[PDB]
C-alpha cells in the first residue's frame, strides 16, 4: 500500500488484518502483523483494536517502537517473516503478513548505513536498498507440494507523495502490484481513499473467476475500470472547458465516477464486504450505464447479471 503522511493507512491496515479471510477454510488462516518504528500511541491503536475485534486470536504481532534501536527496527520484519514462514510451510497455514511502516524500515537502514561509514546511494539511501528490500518481499509465495502460503502487504508512506522516491520506487520493482492512497480521495472522505487508476495487482487473474469468485469478476473489473477512466476524464474536462464542452454521453460517465467513489470505493473502515456483495454492487453501478456501451462484457454475462 503506497500511502502518505496523514493518510489513513493504519485504519486500512487494521481493517485488512481483521477482515482478511480465506473462503471454505476453518482455522487455517493467520495474520502476522509487523509494526516498524511507529509511535507508542500508534502501536496501542493496533494492539487494542486487534484484541477488541478478537483479531488477536488468529494473529501474531511483532511490535517495534520508534524509540527502539535502529537495528531492532531492521530486524523486525525478519522476525515476522520467520514466524510467518514457520506457520505457513511447517504448519500448513495461509499467512497474511502486514508490515508498516516500510518507510521507517528504510530510514532505520539508512541510519545504520551511515553509522558504518558506508557509501550513500541515491537520495541518501544505501546502494543495497533494492536487494535488502528484496530479501524481505521475496519471502512471500508458495512452494510446490506444500499446504500453506506467505502473502505480504508491505505498507509505506511516499515522502512528498513522490512515487519516484527510492522507497516506493524500489518497492514497486520488487512487489507485484501497488495499492495507492491519494489525498484527493481522503479529502473527499472516501474510506479507504484508494485510487484504482494508478493502483494495480499483477496476479489478480490467479485469484479470480468461477470457483474462486463469481464468473463475472474479470469482465466487470475491466468494465468498471474503463468506465471510471472516462468519467474521471469527463470531470477533468468539465473543470477546464466548462460543463458545456461535455456531450450527453459524457453526462453519465461523470455521474458514474462520482457514485463509484462515494458508494463503491468508499465503504468505511469497518464495513466488511464479501466478494459476492462487492460484485453485486459492481453491476448496480454498471446499470446506470447504457448497455450498448458495455463492450468489455459479453452478452452472456449481461443477460444474466445486469439489472
Amino acid at each position: 500500500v503506497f500511502s502518505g503522511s496523514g493518510l489513513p493507512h493504519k485504519e486500512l491496515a487494521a481493517q485488512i488484518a481483521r477482515q482478511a479471510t480465506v473462503l471454505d477454510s476453518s482455522d487455517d488462516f493467520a495474520v502476522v502483523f509487523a509494526a516498524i518504528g511507529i509511535t507508542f500511541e500508534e502501536a496501542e491503536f493496533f494492539m487494542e483494536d486487534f484484541r477488541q475485534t478478537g483479531a488477536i486470536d488468529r494473529s501474531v504481532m511483532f511490535m517495534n517502537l520508534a524509540n527502539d534501536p535502529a537495528i531492532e527496527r531492521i530486524a523486525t520484519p525478519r522476525m515476522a517473516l520467520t514466524a510467518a514462514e514457520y506457520l505457513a510451510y511447517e504448519k500448513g497455514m495461509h499467512v497474511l503478513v502486514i508490515m508498516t511502516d516500510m518507510t521507517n524500515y528504510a530510514e532505520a537502514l539508512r541510519e545504520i548505513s551511515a553509522a558504518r561509514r558506508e557509501v550513500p546511494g541515491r537520495r541518501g539511501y544505501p546502494g543495497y536498498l533494492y536487494t535488502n528490500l528484496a530479501t524481505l518481499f521475496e519471502r512471500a509465495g508458495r512452494i510446490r507440494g506444500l499446504k500453506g502460503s506467505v502473502t505480504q502487504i508491505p505498507i509505506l508512506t511516499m515522502p512528498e507523495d513522490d512515487k519516484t522516491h527510492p522507497i516506493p520506487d524500489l518497492t514497486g520493482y520488487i512487489t507485484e502490484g501497488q495499492i495507492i492512497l491519494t489525498r484527493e480521495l481522503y479529502k473527499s472522505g472516501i474510506q479507504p481513499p484508494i485510487d484504482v487508476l494508478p493502483s494495480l495487482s499483477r496476479l489478480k487473474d490467479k485469484g479470480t473467476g468461477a470457483g474462486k469468485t463469481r464468473e463475472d469478476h474479470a469482465a466487470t473489473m475491466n468494465q468498471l475500470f474503463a468506465a471510471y477512466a472516462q468519467g474521471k476524464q469527463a470531470k477533468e474536462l468539465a473543470v477546464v472547458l466548462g460543463e458545456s464542452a461535455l456531450s450527453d454521453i459524457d453526462k453519465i460517465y461523470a455521474k458514474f465516477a462520482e457514485r463509484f467513489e462515494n458508494e463503491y470505493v468508499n465503504q468505511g473502515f469497518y464495513t466488511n464486504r464479501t466478494i459476492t456483495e462487492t460484485l453485486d454492487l459492481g453491476w448496480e453501478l454498471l446499470a446506470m450505464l447504457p448497455r450498448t456501451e458495455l463492450k468489455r462484457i459479453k452478452d452472456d454475462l449481461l443477460d444474466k447479471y445486469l439489472p
Binding site: 503522511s5 509511535t39 500511541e41 520508534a66
Partner: protein
Amino acid sequence: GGDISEPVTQNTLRVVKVFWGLDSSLAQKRHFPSINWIQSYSLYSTEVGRYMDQILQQDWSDMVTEGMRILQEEEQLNEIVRLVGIDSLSDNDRLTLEVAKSIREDYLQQNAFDDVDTFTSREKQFNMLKVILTFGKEARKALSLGAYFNEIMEGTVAVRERISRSKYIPEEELAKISSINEEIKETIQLIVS
C-alpha cells in the same frame, strides 16, 4: 526556511499529534493568539471530543466540528468575495460569513492581558461556542422562513454585541452567557414578524 518542510519539523510531526501553526500574517491583523486555524491540527480532537461529551453531558464534539466547518467554508467564500464582490452573493453564504466572523472575533481572538479573557474555562468555552452557533441557524430559519438577511442584522445589533462580549463575563456570573441563547430566538422571532 520559515516554512515547515524542514527535516526537524517533519521528524517532529512524525512522533507528535498536535501542531499549532503561529502565523505572522494573523498577528498583523491584530488577531491574537495568531494561530492559523486552517494549517493547525490535533489528532487528539476526536478522543478529547468523547471526553468532553462525557464530562459536559453535551454534544461538544458536534459543535466543534460544525465550528470548524464554518471556518472552512469562510476560506472558500472569501475567495468568491474578492473575485466577484460582497453584494453579489447568497444570503446563506453571507450569514456564514458573519458567523465565521463571530467565531474569529468573539471566540478565537483572546487577550492575554485582560483579567477575564486571559482564561476561559471548559464550561465557559461551551457556553460561548453555543451562543455563536445558536445565532447561526436561528438566523438561518428566518432566512428559510421568508425573512431577509439584512433585516436580521439590525434586529440583532443588541444581542450580537452581547455575544461579542461573552469573553468578558466573569466565571461566577456564567449564566449571563447562556441567557443570550433565549434572547436570540425571541429577537429573531420578532424580526420574522
